[PDB]
C-alpha cells in the first residue's frame, strides 16, 4: 500500500481491486501530508488526514472529477480554518475564517487569472476589496449589498459596482460645476460600455469586457461617430488619463 488520475487544484489521487468489507480505497498527497480515505465508485471521488500541528485536513472530491473542496479544521474537527474550493476551469475560491466562524478573507481566482482579493472583513460585512487585472490593480471597498471599485482622477470618481448577483454596473460622478468641463456618463448593461459625455458631446467609450479587461475607444471631434480601434488598458494610469 499503495502502488499497484489527475485532479483539479494541482492534486493527484490513486486501488483497483475492491477493499475488504467495504468500498473503494484511495490515497492522495497534498502539501507533503499523506491523506487516505475510502469512496464508493472507482473514479477517485473524501480524503481525511491529520496535521503535524494537530489540525484536521479533509479533501472532498466531486463525483464527476470536476471540483475539489480542501478544508482545514481547528483540531476539534468542527471549527473552520481554511476552505479552498478549486474547480476544473482553474476557478479556485479560497476562504479563511476568523476565530468566531465568519469569513475574513475571500480570494476569488477566475479562469483567466484575474483575481478578486477581499481582505479584513468586519462583522457587519465591510471589507477592503480589490481586483487584480492583467497589468493593473483596482481597489475599493465591500458592502453587504455589492462590491464597489473606485478610480479617482481629480474631481471625477469612477465607480465599478459588482452586484452580489454578479451584475457589473458602472457609474461616474463629477464634482465639476461648469457644464463646459463637467463630465457625465451613461451605462448600457447590454453592450457593457460606459459612454462619457462632456459639454453635451460624447468623448470616449469605455468597454468592460467579459474576459475581465477594459478597452477604451475615442469619439470624433464632433461626437458623431467612433474613431480608431479599441485600446485595451494595461496600466492604472491609463484609466485615469481617460477621466
Amino acid at each position, epitope marked *: 500500500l499503495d502502488e499497484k488520475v489527475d485532479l483539479p487544484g494541482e492534486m493527484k489521487v490513486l486501488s483497483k481491486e475492491k477493499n475488504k468489507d467495504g468500498k473503494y480505497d484511495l490515497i492522495a498527497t497534498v502539501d507533503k501530508l499523506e491523506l487516505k480515505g475510502t469512496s464508493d465508485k472507482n473514479n477517485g471521488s*473524501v480524503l481525511e488526514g491529520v496535521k503535524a500541528d494537530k489540525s484536521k485536513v*479533509k479533501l472532498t472530491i466531486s463525483d464527476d472529477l470536476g471540483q475539489t473542496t480542501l478544508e482545514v479544521f481547528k483540531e476539534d*474537527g*468542527k*471549527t*473552520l480554518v481554511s476552505k479552498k474550493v478549486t474547480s476544473k476551469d482553474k476557478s479556485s475560491t479560497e476562504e479563511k475564517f476568523n*476565530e*468566531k*466562524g*465568519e*469569513v475574513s478573507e475571500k480570494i476569488i481566482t477566475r479562469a483567466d487569472g484575474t483575481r478578486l482579493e477581499y481582505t479584513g472583513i468586519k*462583522s457587519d460585512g465591510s471589507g477592503k476589496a480589490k481586483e487584480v487585472l492583467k497589468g493593473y490593480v483596482l481597489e475599493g471597498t465591500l458592502t453587504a449589498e455589492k462590491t464597489t471599485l473606485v478610480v479617482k482622477e481629480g474631481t471625477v470618481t469612477l465607480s465599478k459596482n459588482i452586484s452580489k448577483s454578479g451584475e457589473v454596473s458602472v457609474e461616474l460622478n463629477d464634482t465639476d460645476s461648469s457644464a463646459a468641463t463637467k463630465k457625465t456618463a451613461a451605462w448600457n448593461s447590454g453592450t457593457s460600455t460606459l459612454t462619457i459625455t462632456v459639454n453635451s458631446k460624447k468623448t470616449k467609450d469605455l468597454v468592460f469586457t467579459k474576459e475581465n479587461t477594459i478597452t477604451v475607444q475615442q469619439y470624433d471631434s464632433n461626437g458623431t461617430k467612433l474613431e480608431g480601434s479599441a485600446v485595451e488598458i494595461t496600466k492604472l494610469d491609463e484609466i485615469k488619463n481617460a477621466l
Partner: antibody, heavy 121, light 108 residues
Framework: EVQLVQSGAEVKKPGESLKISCQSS????????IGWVRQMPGKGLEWMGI????????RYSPSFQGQVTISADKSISTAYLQWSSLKASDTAMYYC??????????????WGQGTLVTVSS | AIQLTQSPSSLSASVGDRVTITCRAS??????LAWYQQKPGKAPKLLIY???SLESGVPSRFSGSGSGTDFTLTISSLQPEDFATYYC?????????FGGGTKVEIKR
C-alpha cells in the same frame, strides 16, 4: 469534558420578569458561540438567539427580536436568557447551546440539560 | 424563511434493520445541514454536521448524505438504544430552522 449547566426549573406569573442562566465548563468560553433554543410542548425546536463572548455580538431570531435579551458575563463563564414581562405563551423548555459557526450561521454541537419554564398563575 | 419538512413522522423497525430519514427543504443548498437525536427525557445530541460528517463519540453505524433539496440520515444496524426523535436543521439562510421531528420505534 465540555459541560453546560443550566438554572433550575422555575415558576412565574404573567407579567413577572425572569432571568435564567447557563454555566459553562470544559472549553475556552470566549471563543465559541452560545445561544438559546426553545422547544414548545407538543411543538418542536425553535431558535431564539446566540451570542459570542466577549465581543458580545448578540444575534436574535426575528420571531424573538425585541421579545427577549441574551447576555454573557465572560468572567464567570455564564450566559443568560432574560425577559421583561412573561406571557403564558412562553411556557416551554429552554436549552443553552454551544454552536460552531458556518458562514453567518451555526450548528449546535453541545446542549444543556434544559430549563423548564412554567408560566401560570 | 426556509421551511424544513421531515418524513416519515413515525417509523417502526426491528433490531439489525437499516432505516433512513429524509429532510425535505423549502429551498436548495449543499452541506449545510445537521442531525440531532433527542432520546426521551434527555436533550438533543449532535449526530452529524455538514450533512455528511459524523462526530466522534457517536457510533460508526450513523451516516448522512444528500444535496440540493433532499438530505438523508441513515442507521446501519439499528439498536434498541436508538429509540428517539430525530431532527434536521439548516444553517444556510438565517434564522436557523428545524424539522418537525421523526420518531423511531423498535419492533420487539
Amino acid at each position: 469534558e465540555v459541560q453546560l449547566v443550566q438554572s433550575g426549573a422555575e415558576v412565574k406569573k404573567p407579567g413577572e420578569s425572569l432571568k435564567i442562566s447557563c454555566q459553562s465548563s470544559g472549553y475556552r468560553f470566549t471563543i465559541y458561540w452560545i445561544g438559546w433554543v426553545r422547544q414548545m410542548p407538543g411543538k418542536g425546536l425553535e431558535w431564539m438567539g446566540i451570542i459570542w463572548p466577549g465581543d458580545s455580538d448578540t444575534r436574535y431570531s426575528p420571531s424573538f427580536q425585541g421579545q427577549v435579551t441574551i447576555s454573557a458575563d465572560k468572567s464567570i463563564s455564564t450566559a443568560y436568557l432574560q425577559w421583561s414581562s412573561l406571557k403564558a405563551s412562553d411556557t416551554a423548555m429552554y436549552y443553552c447551546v454551544r454552536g460552531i459557526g458556518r458562514y453567518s450561521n451555526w450548528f449546535l454541537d453541545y446542549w444543556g440539560q434544559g430549563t423548564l419554564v412554567t408560566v401560570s398563575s | 424563511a426556509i421551511q424544513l419538512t421531515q418524513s416519515p413522522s413515525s417509523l417502526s423497525a426491528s433490531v439489525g434493520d437499516r432505516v433512513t430519514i429524509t429532510c425535505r427543504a423549502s429551498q436548495g443548498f449543499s452541506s449545510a445541514l445537521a442531525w440531532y437525536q433527542q432520546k426521551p427525557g434527555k436533550a438533543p445530541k449532535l449526530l452529524i454536521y455538514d450533512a455528511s460528517s459524523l462526530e466522534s463519540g457517536v457510533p460508526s453505524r450513523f451516516s448522512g448524505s444528500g444535496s440540493g433539496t433532499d438530505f438523508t440520515l441513515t442507521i446501519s444496524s439499528l439498536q434498541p438504544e436508538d429509540f428517539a426523535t430525530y431532527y434536521c436543521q439548516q444553517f444556510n439562510s438565517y434564522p436557523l430552522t428545524f424539522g418537525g421531528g421523526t420518531k423511531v420505534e423498535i419492533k420487539r
